[PDB]
Amino acid sequence: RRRVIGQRKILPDPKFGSELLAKFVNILMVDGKKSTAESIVYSALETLAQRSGKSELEAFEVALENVRPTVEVKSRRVGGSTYQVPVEVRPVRRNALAMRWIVEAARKRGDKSMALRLANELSDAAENKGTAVKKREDVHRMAEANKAFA
Amino acid sequence: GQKVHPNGIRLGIVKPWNSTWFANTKEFADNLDSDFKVRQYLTKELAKASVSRIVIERPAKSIRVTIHTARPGIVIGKKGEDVEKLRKVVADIAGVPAQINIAEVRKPELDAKLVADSITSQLERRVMFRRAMKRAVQNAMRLGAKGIKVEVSGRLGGAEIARTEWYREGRVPLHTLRADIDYNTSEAHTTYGVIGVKVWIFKGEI
Amino acid sequence: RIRIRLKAFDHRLIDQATAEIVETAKRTGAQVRGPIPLPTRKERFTVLISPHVNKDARDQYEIRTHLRLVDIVEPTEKTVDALMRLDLAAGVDVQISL
Amino acid sequence: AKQSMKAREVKRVALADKYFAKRAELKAIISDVNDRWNAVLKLQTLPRDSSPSRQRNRCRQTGRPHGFLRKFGLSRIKVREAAMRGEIPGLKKASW
Amino acid sequence: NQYYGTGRRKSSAARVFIKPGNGKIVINQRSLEQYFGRETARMVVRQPLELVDMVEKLDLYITVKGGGISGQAGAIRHGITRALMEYDESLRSELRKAGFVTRDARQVERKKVGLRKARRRPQFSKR
Amino acid sequence: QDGTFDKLTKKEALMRTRELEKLENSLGGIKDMGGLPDALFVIDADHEHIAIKEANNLGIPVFAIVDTNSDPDGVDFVIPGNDDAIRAVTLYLGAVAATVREGRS
RNA sequence: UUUUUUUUUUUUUUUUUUUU
RNA sequence: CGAAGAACCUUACCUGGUCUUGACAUCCACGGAAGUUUUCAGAGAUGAGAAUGUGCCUUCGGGAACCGUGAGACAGGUGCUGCAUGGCUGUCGUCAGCUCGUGUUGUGAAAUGUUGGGUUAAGUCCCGCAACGAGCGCAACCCUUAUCCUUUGUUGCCAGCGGUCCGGCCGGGAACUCAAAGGAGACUGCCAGUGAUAAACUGGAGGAAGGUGGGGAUGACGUCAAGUCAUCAUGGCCCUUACGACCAGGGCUACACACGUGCUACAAUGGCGCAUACAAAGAGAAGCGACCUCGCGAGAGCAAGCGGACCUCAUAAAGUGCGUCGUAGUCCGGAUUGGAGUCUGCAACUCGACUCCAUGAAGUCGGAAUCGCUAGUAAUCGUGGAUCAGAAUGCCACGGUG
């Protein structure tokens, strides 16, 4: 496994030139069909701005602050039983793993449409109320805590 | 644990054909039934001196049979009454005439076949063939070649006895597709069952 | 657009052939085609001539198997007769059925 | 069933155009369900063992009917050798 | 006077011609917008020619032989690159540095028998 | 001796440049060896190991410059003397290099 | 020289003769 | 399972009819023209009648093409053993193999090149070492790419004009795809950093790949005492009133039980209704078959065509735009059972395979724990092929939204 080749390069969103808004959708896809999934994510960002009447896509961050973790738990039985030690995630990982908990909260969410299951949970996520934020805070209650047991 | 042909895999490389003919889409089948029949009559008419090469060409399906035998004078016979028989019986099956061409087997000592037609004669005496076997090999290699291996299988003792014997008078690199090597085999019997002999003759390096 | 499908066992023997048809036939009319290929079957061929049942001696040969297209605009006999007088080439085939 | 039935195919194999497949070319066209004539068919079905098409076939290079591959012209056991003199041009290293 | 290319990508089969002035993008008898009207890649074909002020200088004419819109977006990349590749030798450094010269050729030593990854040999720190 | 060694691809000839390497440094005073040597001259009986055994096996005369560590029973002529470096074997080699040419008569 | 992540899993019958 | 067709079916077996040169096939003996057609029996093999017929040479000798009856020789079958052996295929092994033609420290089962200093991810590569080198595995040819250079133009194909009766229609010329024959080019190649200016690892100039570029592929000794013991090619041994060969029937599928492969069906990241945008892998004269006639349609029929860009199967699914439910056991569930139809057949019915309506079994997100699947790789989105008088849900192979 000696050679550096270990992650996909992907291209930016069609509007704001950001691989952020692009990895969002490409986490949300779960069944394939991209370009109409990308137009429905573009419909999420307009339903978002109905709340406030401005560039709420700047507040995309002010939700994503609460969904990003510092730590993840992987296979570490080292010490004769389960001895975790999470280790932190490298800077490039903080917000892709936040997209992972935004999409598992959206799947059964219950809101009228899927544009609204994402745009509401982002709204909650800025409120720290969120179900994507609750999963992260669980890990912080878990393995960032278990710093003190390592 | 293998038997690995040097020849056959190499038709255009120092090691020339047993036979070659061009029969077309709906004219092969009878040509193939005739390629065992024409070789069965010849290899029983020529037995008195063997045939190193029993060469079937068919220049216009009519058959140019070139017989490298160690005594052509005995198949020219008393001067050409056998030739007449020899050009009729193989042409009787094939429905076409037969271009009988003769040759000598230039020194059976160094040959691509006639070493196994020493050995398989030796059994027609029924007594101690072991006196002569490995001596025949010796003799052959004294006029030509640079190594030879020999394998003999069959009923070669008494009552119920059945074994295989293996000998090596010189080195043999088993397959080298560049070299003047041959493989051959021949057969013999002894009134109890078979006696089947095999050779590998590393004569030269290219 | 009468397709004379020219075909030889070898590249050697259709080259020798076609270069006379695109000369001979064309002299007064129809712009005669002759180099344009079909799926030329450069295959690997294997026959068993092994003097006993042992390993290999299935001598793998290659082949060329090469076909082209002679094409004429009309049955203009004062230009085309010459290729039909070429009946004496009994060592190439042509399949004119169209 | 080794050789079996060959004689009884042979005895009528060449005349199926005379048991039907030309005998038909006027009387039997009015006998269609396209053309209606209902008393006519019931006298031409009589030929039974030689009603076309029905053919036991002949595997030939094999001496007994261990199938017949109607795409290639040989028995369901023979195939190996095609690859070894020219009969199946498409048989390289299998795709599996 | 004119400059040209052709492409092969998922699965098409497209050509492209550069032409003198007026700056437009004409696929057989219609505009870009009519052919990718929702199809989110659409900018990537006009992007490297809007650098070099196309609007009074070039004109772009296209035709297509098995559509393939999701894959066409790179058949055109390679094609429109072969055209600019004789317009001005200067920009081979811009086309490379922007990825606009690259074309699909690679698998990353993938599976043949069972194992996932299949070129790299046994590795150790002193066996 | 001629140009013919620069045959085939260039890495075929070099793959023998690098035999010639591994062999003329070990072997460059013996290049023929078409008969068996008749006599030997040695300077170590440790570092030269096998040669003294091969020689005593076959019955060869051995001329041997030896120190307080030696085994003199394994030779035909000892010359007791300082074991190693240039000054010692200089002081003997004049008269060896003489006798082996003016002695041809 | 701290080295318990469970203890156990019936018999056979494999064996291409021999003197060198 | 082997059966890629266990109801004529390549017959296991249940039955009966029959035979044991059988069904196929020779060497002499005595003889004959070969066949078309119909009637009646019989389950089939086989039985009883009736008409019409008479070939080519040609010593009228000998006979052919081709059918008899008498002889004496005389025919057969997956029956398995890997172990008489030699092809073949595997999972290991893409380890850079083990041993010898010599020599000799080990008497010999110890590899004896692994030592003793170092090095590289690397049996990498600098030495050192009592070790050579013989050479069949080696240096690699191999096919498809893909990018081009010429010759080139194809049912192709249309760059720029020439006419449009708006069909590349046919004029008209060679950009270039298409097609492809011969082939031909990328190397540490020069630049930034690295360290031993070794080592090779990153980013790049320069590209169609990069440090086997990829995808096919060759699979050496050694292969588990693993198979192909059901075509092997054949030594040792096989049943012969018999494991030999002719023939119509039948029934394999039950069910209380599993248990899983293989299926789906639980509604919106969904579909439902009319409307809009783009590909192809492959197959084809025991063929494939349009338009066009007939339509509730499976399914009838006419009939242009097509031999490999021409004929036809797909008018890939998503997707887009406007309409339509309201979270609803239903509008979807084809599990299935009322009646209604046919393409085949001696033959499918207590045995199907499928077409039209009428339906409505479970339905509602079930845990325990068999391994699917690391990248262009299982979800996701589809097509073909032969066995064969022919319905696999198998597998087999490349494509792509992902």
Using CA atoms, how far apart are residues A118 and A132, in angstroms rounded to an integer? 10
Closest-CA distance, D63 to chain C, in angstroms, reads: 23
Radius of gyration over every alpha carbon of chain C, rounded to an integer in angstroms: 18
Hey, which bits of chain B come out as E strands? 19-20, 53-60, 62-69, 101-104, 148-154, 163-168, 182-189, 194-201
Using CA atoms, how far apart are residues F22 and B37, in angstroms rounded to an integer? 62
Which positions in strand G are less than 7 Å from the protein's CB atoms?
Answer: 5, 17-18
Chain E residues with CB-CB distance to A34 below 8 A: 40
- Residue in chain B closest to C56 (alpha carbons) equals B9
For residue F12 the two structure tokens come to: 């075929």
Residue D58 in contact with residue D4, Cβ under 8 Å?
Answer: no
Q: Tell me whether residues D85 and C43 touch, CB distance under 8 A.
A: no
Residue B73 in contact with residue B67, Cβ under 8 Å?
Answer: no
Angle between helices A114-126 and A131-139 in degrees, nearest 10: 50
F19 by DSSP, 3-state: which? helix
Using CA atoms, how far apart are residues C28 and B155, in angstroms rounded to an integer? 83
Q: What are phi and psi of A60, to 5 degrees?
A: -55, -40
Strand H contact residues in chain A (51-70), C-beta within 7 Å:
none
For residue E125 the two structure tokens come to: 């720190």
D60 touches strand H (CB under 7 A): no
Q: Which domains, from first to last, does chain C contain?
A: 1-98 (3.30.70.600)
Say whether the B–C interface has 3 or more Cβ pairs within 8 Å.
yes
E4 burial via Cβ count (<10 Å: 0-12, 13-18, 19+): middle
Q: Starting at the edge strand that comes first in sequence, how are the strands of the sheet with B62-69 ordered?
A: B19-20, B53-60, B62-69, B101-104
Say whether the F–E interface has 3 or more Cβ pairs within 8 Å.
no
Pairing verdict, β B62-69 and B163-168? unpaired
Domain range summary for chain D, segments of one domain joined by +:
1-86
Using CA atoms, how far apart are residues B40 and B49, in angstroms rounded to an integer? 15
Resolution of the entry in angstroms: 9.0
B166 by DSSP, 3-state: which? strand
Chains that touch E (3 or more CB pairs under 8 A): A
Chain A residues with CB-CB distance to E43 below 8 A: 14
Q: Which CATH number fits domain A19-146: 1.10.260.40, 3.40.640.10, 1.10.455.10, 3.40.190.10?
A: 1.10.455.10
CB-defined contacts A:E, below 8 A: 18
Residue F81 in contact with residue F65, Cβ under 8 Å?
Answer: yes
Residues belonging to chain E with any Cβ–Cβ distance to chain A shorter than 8 Å: 38-40, 43, 70, 108, 117, 120, 123
Closest-CA distance, C81 to chain D, in angstroms, reads: 37
Nearest CB to D84 within list C43, C44, C47? C47
Domain count, chain E: 1
DSSP 8-class letter at C68: B
Using CA atoms, how far apart are residues F65 and F77, in angstroms rounded to an integer? 9
B195 forms beta bridges with B154, B188
Q: What are phi and psi of F93, to 5 degrees?
A: -60, -15
Structural domain harbouring E120: 1-127
Domain range summary for chain A, segments of one domain joined by +:
19-146
Residue A139 in contact with residue A71, Cβ under 8 Å?
Answer: yes
Which residue shows structure tokens 């082996």?
Answer: F100
Q: Which long-range contacts (CB under 8 A, 24 or more apart) does B166-171 make?
A: B167/B134, B167/B137, B169/B134, B169/B137, B169/B138, B169/B141, B170/B141, B170/B145, B170/B146, B170/B202, B171/B146, B171/B147, B171/B202
Residues belonging to chain D with any Cβ–Cβ distance to chain C shorter than 8 Å: 83-86, 89, 92
Radius of gyration over every alpha carbon of chain B, rounded to an integer in angstroms: 19
Strand G contact residues in chain B (150-189), C-beta within 7 Å:
160-163
